[PDB]
């Protein structure tokens, strides 16, 4: 697995199972599941008021207010319609599935439910992609604190939309590894000439953010994606959002997988050294 | 002269003048072999070997007798344990499993000199030995110091005699002198 998946397997498997038993005519079993996603996301799947014929899926994002300022409530309603209800205390968005009133295609709602986190983030991109398409320049940039100490900046310009990530490498050595990955991204147009352009600044924001309170430090790295109309149009939009919202986690995932691979190299070389060493003995 | 006897149950420092013992000037130490085996169990636990205090007491006792020793300079011993593997010895358990024992070899017996390590009040076999000789008769101090003798199963740890000697030098230098007047500070533990 190179690319990270977008959908949540716990949500889909949980709902699929409830939906198949409901359709089969079985009595419903109680469900109570608390689990996470990347970026400090917390989910809760439960039976509201103990009614086992109702299944609620809730998401909590510390930065939801920020997404709401950029259309989240509207998009979520467009996607989930009547499944969307008043949010459970402790959470920002809640979906309610009535087992006695399921649609003909149960698989399709399982899929959208699995993409709840992605769908929360979608509005901010769609908003700035729209700005670009309409030629509305000068609009204030979106500022999304997706992690306690990380920030995503979205700005629409005449011919492009920029997405800037301010990420933190807690492990000093991960910065060094991360720089190897970022240099390849910087040179990426050498393999896909139409792909977004990527920039990288270590320990300092891009100049446009120098006058704000953007973080500065030895373990901070800034990454800029430059998205063009071919990436931001109505036809490419969904796929583009699916990718860009996973980028930060994609990078950190690959740094960790690289370290694991290097461990395999170390096991092999050390094992070989020990065999040589033992061959220096006359024997037992 | 003074005899240091450490067995499995208790320790005793017994001075003797031209014939017999003198209860006044006789002190007992609240730490002995069993206490060292117990501390070893605790040390091994910290190393990841959870031996049961009852079921495996004899096994850990056997590990102690075979591998334990008394450190001369704990600072140096700790450096050896932390920075090298020269102290690491393999020991085969009765069920065939082989474990690896290192720094715990000198740590366990150190309780004899640092009773607080096992939550016991006191000053340690050596400081104790010193206080017995220092307070006694003035006309036997010299004779006493040069006639200390070890006895018992818990006194056979490699290095024990050398450690005792070193600890008395440090005590005599500090609590009987101040500057360097050692040379003549003669005393042998044979």
């Amino acid at each position: 697995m190179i690319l990270l998946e977008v959908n949540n397997r716990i949500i889909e498997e949980t709902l699929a199972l409830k939906f198949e038993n409901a359709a089969a005519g079985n009595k419903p079993e109680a469900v109570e599941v608390t689990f996470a996603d990347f970026d400090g996301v917390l989910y809760h799947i439960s039976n509201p008021n103990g009614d086992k014929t109702k299944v609620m899926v809730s998401i909590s994002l510390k930065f939801y207010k920020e997404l709401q300022a950029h259309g989240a409530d509207e998009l979520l309603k467009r996607v989930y319609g009547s499944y969307l209800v008043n949010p459970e205390s402790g959470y920002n968005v809640s979906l309610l599935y009535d087992l006695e009133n399921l649609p003909a295609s149960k698989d399709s709602i399982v899929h959208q439910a699995g993409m709840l986190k992605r769908n929360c983030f979608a509005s901010v991109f769609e908003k700035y992609f729209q700005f670009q398409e309409e030629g509305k320049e000068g609009e204030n940039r979106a500022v999304i604190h997706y992690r306690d100490d990380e920030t995503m900046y979205v700005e629409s310009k005449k011919d492009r939309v920029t997405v800037v990530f301010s990420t933190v490498f807690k492990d000093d050595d991960d910065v060094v590894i991360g720089k190897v990955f970022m240099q390849e991204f910087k040179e990426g147009r050498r393999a896909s000439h139409t792909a977004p352009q990527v920039l990288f600044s270590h320990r300092e924001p891009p100049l446009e953010l120098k006058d704000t309170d953007a973080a500065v430090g030895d373990n901070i790295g800034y990454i800029t994606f430059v998205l063009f109309p071919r990436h931001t149009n109505a036809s490419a939009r969904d796929n583009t959002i699916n990718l860009i919202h996973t980028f930060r986690d994609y990078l950190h995932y690959h740094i960790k997988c690289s370290k694991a691979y290097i461990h395999t190299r170390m096991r092999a070389k050390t094992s070989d050294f020990l065999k040589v060493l033992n061959r220096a003995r006359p024997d037992a | 002269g003074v005899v240091v006897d450490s067995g499995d149950g208790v320790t005793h420092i017994c001075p003797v003048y031209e014939g017999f013992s003198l209860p006044h000037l006789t002190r007992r130490l609240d730490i002995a072999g069993r206490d060292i085996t117990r501390y070893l169990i605790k040390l091994l636990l910290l190393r990841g070997y959870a031996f049961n205090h009852s079921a495996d007491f004899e096994t850990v006792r056997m590990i102690k007798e075979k591998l334990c020793y008394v450190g001369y300079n704990i600072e140096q011993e700790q450096k050896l344990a932390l920075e090298t593997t020269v102290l690491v010895e393999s020991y085969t358990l009765p069920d065939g499993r082989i474990i690896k024992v290192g720094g715990e070899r000198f740590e366990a017996p150190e309780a004899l000199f640092q009773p607080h390590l096992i939550n016991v009040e006191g000053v340690g076999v050596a400081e104790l030995l010193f206080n017995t000789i220092q307070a006694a008769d003035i006309d036997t101090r010299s004779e006493f110091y040069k006639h200390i003798v070890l006895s018992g199963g818990s006194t056979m740890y490699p290095g024990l005699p050398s450690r005792l000697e070193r600890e008395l030098k440090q005590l005599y230098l500090e609590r009987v002198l101040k500057g360097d007047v050692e040379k003549l500070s003669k005393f042998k533990i044979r």
Binding site: - | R166, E167, K169, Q170, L173, E174, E182
Partner: protein, 139 residues
């Protein structure tokens, strides 16, 4: 503990004490030879009267400089001949200075010093290195 902080061993009468007592080669002489392109001659002069007995590292560090100055000034192909002009004692002393040099690398100084090591080893064998190791009085 306190009483354990003192290293009583430093006052042990039964320890071991080295036999110590209380200038180097002629700087001007080495310079003369070098200035005249007489390298072998400079080598032999730099190896004279080594401060094997002084306490201060300043005088020792001085002779090592002079000796090192000479080794660096040498042409690669002319090393073997100079080394072969020395007696066994000279070869042993040279090896001591070479190891000395390994501790102050700068530019390609170690690069030529490895050449010297090779030639000196060819002349004095591993025994000359052994004698760097157990010297109590050294450069």
């Amino acid at each position: 503990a306190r009483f354990r902080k003192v290293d009583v061993d430093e006052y042990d009468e039964n320890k071991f004490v080295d036999e110590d007592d209380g200038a180097g080669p002629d700087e001007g002489e080495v310079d003369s030879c070098l200035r005249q392109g007489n390298m072998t001659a400079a080598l032999q002069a730099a190896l004279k009267n080594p401060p094997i007995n002084t306490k201060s590292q300043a005088v020792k560090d001085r002779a090592g400089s002079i000796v090192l100055k000479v080794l660096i000034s040498f042409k690669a192909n002319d090393i073997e001949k100079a080394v072969q002009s020395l007696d066994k004692n000279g070869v042993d002393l040279l090896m001591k200075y070479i190891y000395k040099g390994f501790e102050s690398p700068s530019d390609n100084s170690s690069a030529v010093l490895l050449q010297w090591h090779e030639k000196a080893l060819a002349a004095g064998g591993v025994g000359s290195i052994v004698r760097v190791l157990t010297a109590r009085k050294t450069v």
